[PDB]
Amino acid sequence: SDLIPAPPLSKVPLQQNFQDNQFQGKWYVVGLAGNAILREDKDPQKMYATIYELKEDKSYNVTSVLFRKKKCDYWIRTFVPGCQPGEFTLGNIKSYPGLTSYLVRVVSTNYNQHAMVFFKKVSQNREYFKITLYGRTKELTSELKENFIRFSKSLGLPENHIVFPVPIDQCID
Numbered sequence: 016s017d018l019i020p021a022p023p024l025s026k027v028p029l030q031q032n033f034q035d036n037q038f039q040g041k042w043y044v045v046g047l048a049g050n051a052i053l054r055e056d057k058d059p060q061k062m063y064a065t066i067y068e069l070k071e072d073k074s075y076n077v078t079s080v081l082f083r084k085k086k087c088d089y090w091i092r093t094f095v096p097g098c099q100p101g102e103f104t105l106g107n108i109k110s111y112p113g114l115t116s117y118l119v120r121v122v123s124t125n126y127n128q129h130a131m132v133f134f135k136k137v138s139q140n141r142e143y144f145k146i147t148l149y150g151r152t153k154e155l156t157s158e159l160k161e162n163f164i165r166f167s168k169s170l171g172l173p174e175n176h177i178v179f180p181v182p183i184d185q186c187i188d
């Protein structure tokens with residue numbers, strides 16, 4: 016199992032002045048890229064969504080929804096504020112078999128339109144990294160999508176490892 020090496024953090028920007036309250040709400044995953052992300056053609060990835068909710072202890076209750084096989088699959092997650100506003104670790108790791116690492120980095124966002132988030136984790140000892148292009152709506156500008164493509168590449172990902180989930184109306188509305 017061969018993988019493209021996770022980029023060195025110094026290459027992953029952090030959203031200047033992150034506002035955890037404004038980043039709340041529903042986000043559409045309009046762009047996906049990772050060393051474990053492949054541009055399938057016989058069955059293109061469907062768009063799923065992720066809802067971020069602040070807890071009073073300032074942690075996020077991240078829950079996602081995807082339409083898998085005639086149903087909505089929901090998966091919960093708790094992000095815990097890291098060392099700098101915008102960074103996050105995984106709450107209750109250890110309740111996730113094979114997980115020794117997990118990190119989130121809000122690269123950039125305008126809180127109303129879009130956002131770019133970098134994730135990196137170590138499962139089974141294999142290092143995985145990915146980047147989601149978030150959209151407040153199910154679609155966005157070409158400017159934003161090529162910016163996403165540009166960044167993914169700066170991290171070592173070939174076009175091939177960059178995909179745009181096709182918009183759907185099931186479960187993510």
Ligand SMILES: *[C@@H]1O[C@H](CO)[C@@H](O[C@@H]2O[C@H](CO)[C@@H](O)[C@H](O)[C@H]2NC(C)=O)[C@H](O)[C@H]1NC(C)=O
Nearest residue numbers: 067068069070071074075076077078091092093
């Ligand atoms: C974060 O999620 C937890 C559960 O994931 C929410 O806890 C719920 O809290 C209410 C009121 O205290 C309870 O009635 C529910 O039973 C709890 N749910 C669970 C699964 O334990 C919590 O409210 C969330 N916080 C926000 C602001 O969304």
